[PDB]
Design a protein around this ligand. Structure first.
Ligand code: 8NR
Ligand code: SAM
Ligand code: ZN
Ligand code: ZN
Ligand code: ZN
Length: 423
């Protein structure tokens, strides 16, 4: 028996609403993807199927683009990979955009796979396309994505007979733009992209009552507030460290709607997000583009050096509540944790603690993971009372955002038990 249901909203198309009263932390829906693929920057860094990062990966001898954590992952991914493997091969060294590879797996799964559990509440055919709202610029880009698809899928798709019935490629890419899910690993690293059509019923809110968390490619939908019967479920489409101006631009360009929630009407937290000298954080925001680019390709040393040049700069610095300063603090923490610089990592991680409490209110999985990382760094350095306080606070957040069903909760309990034995 399902706790959620599809329904027609008054001005937001279709949505999800509660069949029953929901409490914080209650699991609402699990789903594998209908189709998914590894991101461009994580390809060869994480297993193509399970999206876990490893020292070494074994590669597909046929294409050599697909790489895996183990022999089980390579053999199990073969059915969903066999048709794409050789549009991939015989197109080297020309790797297609992530969206084109994503749609290729959608077509193969819809053509050759059985009815997907991921389409139980909502199918790929039902997905919103927002076609009558697309600008001519966005249409032009979708036509370039269509011809890119046809060129990449030459060897396996000759004609409309090998596409689903009434399947239009322009509209399919329109659905991908506004229904794609970025997949983040346990450490909140962007590792993949996938489609979850039943989950794609959730409308956006800048202050949601639900949350998404990923266990590999598997998705868990949870309540993070109290929700009463008939109340619509919402998730935040966007990073929390965005101003209302940046949220307006992204919700327009990608999702074709104007948000008039309370937070956007009052520019909630905008001023605190941009404290400090404007010229200083405009450079940091400009430099974050390359910093985040290097992080997407797991080049941690380059991330740290650029972040150190900002955090320990000889020129004027920013307060830690400035979102662009905060992002540099986060990138530097992840770079240090992963180069083994654990005292420098804790220095940056502890600094993000108070800004994260303000910008991730209630129960947000991003804060719970950040707090868990800080508590894990404190425990590894013998700061047992300080570590316990954060590890418990991480459990108070992540037990609502992450599940009994999420593997990271098991890892947190071990750290809690270990820290408890020490105390
Ligand atoms: C990766 C990372 C961060 N947060 C994430 C949040 C989610 C998220 O729950 N999600 C984004 C995709 N989305 C959507 O586009 O709705 C319209 C279809 C649903 C909501 C995904 C991945 C995330 C935090 C920083 C670390 C990376
Ligand atoms: C992932 S789909 C959500 C389900 C969608 N309403 C449907 O019927 O399939 C995202 C699309 O829903 C609409 N939408 C989502 N959140 C909205 C909101 N808060 N206000 C207005 N429209 C919204 C936008 O058109 C967006 O392109
Ligand atoms: Zn694997
Ligand atoms: Zn292959
Ligand atoms: Zn809003």
């Amino acid at each position: 028996p399902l706790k959620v249901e599809k329904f027609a909203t008054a001005n937001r198309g279709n949505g999800l609403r509660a069949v029953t009263p929901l409490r914080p932390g209650e699991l609402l829906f699990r789903s594998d993807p209908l189709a998914y693929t590894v991101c461009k920057g994580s390809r060869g860094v994480v297993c193509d199927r399970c999206l876990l990062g490893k020292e070494k990966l074994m590669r597909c001898s046929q294409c050599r683009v697909a790489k895996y954590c183990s022999a089980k992952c390579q053999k199990k991914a073969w059915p969903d990979h066999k048709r794409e493997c050789k549009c991939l091969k015989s197109c080297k060294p020309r790797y297609p955009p992530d969206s084109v590879r994503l749609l290729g797996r959608v077509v193969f799964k819809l053509m050759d796979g059985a009815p997907s559990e991921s389409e139980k509440l909502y199918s790929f055919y039902d997905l919103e396309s927002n076609i009558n709202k697309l600008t001519e610029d966005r249409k032009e880009g979708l036509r370039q994505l269509v011809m890119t698809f046809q060129h990449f899928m030459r060897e396996e798709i000759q004609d409309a007979s090998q596409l689903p019935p009434a399947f239009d490629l322009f509209e399919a890419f329109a659905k991908v733009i506004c229904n794609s899910f970025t997949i983040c690993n346990a450490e909140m690293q962007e590792v993949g992209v996938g489609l979850y059509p039943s989950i794609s019923l959730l409308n956006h809110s800048c202050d949601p009552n639900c949350s998404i968390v990923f266990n590999g490619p598997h998705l868990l939908l949870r309540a993070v507030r109290d929700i009463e019967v008939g109340e619509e479920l919402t998730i935040c489409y966007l990073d929390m460290l965005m101003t209302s101006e940046e949220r307006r631009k992204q919700l327009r360009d990608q999702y074709c709607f104007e948000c008039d929630c309370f937070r956007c009407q009052t520019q909630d937290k905008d001023a605190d997000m941009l404290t400090g000298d404007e010229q200083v954080w405009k450079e940091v925001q400009e430099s974050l583009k390359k910093i985040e680019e290097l992080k997407a390709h797991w080049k941690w040393e380059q991330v740290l050096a650029m972040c150190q040049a900002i955090i320990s700069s000889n020129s004027e610095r920013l307060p830690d509540i400035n979102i662009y300063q905060l992002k540099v603090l986060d990138c530097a923490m992840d770079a240090c944790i992963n180069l083994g610089l654990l005292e420098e990592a804790l220095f940056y991680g502890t600094r993000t603690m108070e800004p994260y409490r303000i910008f991730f209110p209630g129960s947000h999985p991003v804060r719970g993971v950040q707090v868990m990382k800080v508590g894990k760094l404190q425990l590894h350095q013998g700061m047992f009372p300080q570590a316990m306080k954060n590890l418990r606070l991480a459990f108070d957040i992540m037990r609502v955002t992450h599940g009994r069903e999420h593997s990271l909760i098991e890892d947190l309990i071990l750290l809690l038990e270990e820290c408890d034995a020490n105390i």
